[PDB]
Each structure stands twice: as structure tokens, then as C-alpha cells.
């Protein structure tokens, strides 16, 4: 696939582990990006991570122990980043 788009669902109020919400390649991947941008859902261009989630997981999986720590680091990072901009 020349383009990849993997979506992460995470709501700890409901469920402790994150989930693969979106899974698409090529044209559909481009459309997912355009739609997340339009609708305000953050897009992180992380090639190694995109590539390996694509290889290891499928739509609607829970994130497995192999990749969980990396995904969790991204999620904490995003929350911190939002918080830095939430007081300014």
C-alpha cells in the first residue's frame, strides 16, 4: 500500500485498551485523512507506526501487547499537547 491510514479509538471511561477504529489504504486512506482534517480529528504522520499496525492488526482489533506501549505513548503525548494549548 502506498498510503495507509489507521484510526485509534480510546475511551478509558468505557474500556481500558485502545482499538483500531479505522483501517484503509490508498485512495480510501487519502479520503480518511481529508475527512479527519475536515472534522477536526488529529492526524499523526508516523511512518514506522502506520506500517507496523497495518501489518500486525485489522479493523476492530484491540491494540495487542506488541504495539500497546508505543500507541499509549502517542496517546499520552497527544493529551499533553492538547493540554499545553488548552490554557493559552
Amino acid at each position: 500500500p502506498t498510503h495507509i491510514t489507521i484510526g485509534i479509538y480510546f475511551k478509558p471511561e468505557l474500556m481500558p485498551i485502545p482499538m483500531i477504529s479505522v483501517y484503509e489504504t490508498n485512495q480510501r486512506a487519502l479520503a480518511v485523512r481529508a475527512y479527519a482534517e475536515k472534522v477536526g480529528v488529529p492526524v499523526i504522520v508516523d511512518i514506522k507506526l502506520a506500517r507496523s499496525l497495518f501489518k500486525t492488526h485489522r479493523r476492530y482489533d484491540l491494540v495487542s501487547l506488541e504495539e500497546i506501549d508505543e500507541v499509549l505513548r502517542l496517546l499520552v503525548w497527544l493529551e499533553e499537547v492538547e493540554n499545553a494549548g488548552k490554557d493559552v
Binding site: 484510526g7 477504529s21 480518511v32 480529528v41
Partner: peptide, 20 residues
């Protein structure tokens, strides 16, 4: 067009999208 309402919904409910 190319994304169904299901996937749109799935995007809306995601924390993030990881892309290459």
C-alpha cells in the same frame, strides 16, 4: 463518494488517525 457513513462515524469517534 468513497467513504461510507460507517467509516465517517468511526473517524469521528477516534482519538487519532495514524498515517504514512
Amino acid at each position: 463518494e468513497i467513504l461510507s457513513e460507517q467509516v465517517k462515524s468511526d473517524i469521528e469517534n477516534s482519538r487519532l488517525i495514524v498515517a504514512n
